[PDB]
Amino acid sequence: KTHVQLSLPVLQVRDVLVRGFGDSVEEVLSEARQHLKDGTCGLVEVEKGVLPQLEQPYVFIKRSDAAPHGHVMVELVAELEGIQYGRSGETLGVLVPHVGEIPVAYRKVLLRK
Numbered sequence: 001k002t003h004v005q006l007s008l009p010v011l012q013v014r015d016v017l018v019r020g021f022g023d024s025v026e027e028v029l030s031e032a033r034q035h036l037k038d039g040t041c042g043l044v045e046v047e048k049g050v051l052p053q054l055e056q057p058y059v060f061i062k063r064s065d066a067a068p069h070g071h072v073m074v075e076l077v078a079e080l081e082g083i084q085y086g087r088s089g090e091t092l093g094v095l096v097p098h099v100g101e102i103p104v105a106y107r108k109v110l111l112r113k
C-alpha cells in the first residue's frame, strides 16, 4: 500500500532521549521510515525553541492534502542547514526515535511511505 494509517506518540522535546535519526538527509529519511515501519517513531510538535533542542538533519511530517478515518494525510520532508528535501504543506511536527518516553497525546496520520 502507498499509504499507512499510524498513531504516533507525541513527545515533549525535553523528554526525547535520541534527538534525531542520523547524520545525512538520506540517512534520516531512511531511519525515519524504518522507525515508522517498526512502531518506534515519535512526534514533537514545533514551537519556538524546539528545533534548536533537536539534532539536524530534521525529518518533518507535512500535510500532503486537505483526512480519511480521522488520519491527516502526511509525507516526509528533511531539512539540513535551512535547505528542505521535498516540498509539502504545513508541518505537523518533527519525527524522532521513540525509546519508551511517555507521550502527551497520539497523532493519527495517513502516511505516504
Ligand SMILES: Cc1cc2ccccc2cc1O
Pocket (backbone or CB within 6 Å): 004, 032, 033, 034, 036, 037, 038, 111, 112, 113
Ligand atoms: C514509512 C513506512 C511505514 C511502513 C509501515 C508498515 C509497512 C511498511 C512501511 C514502509 C514505510 O516506508
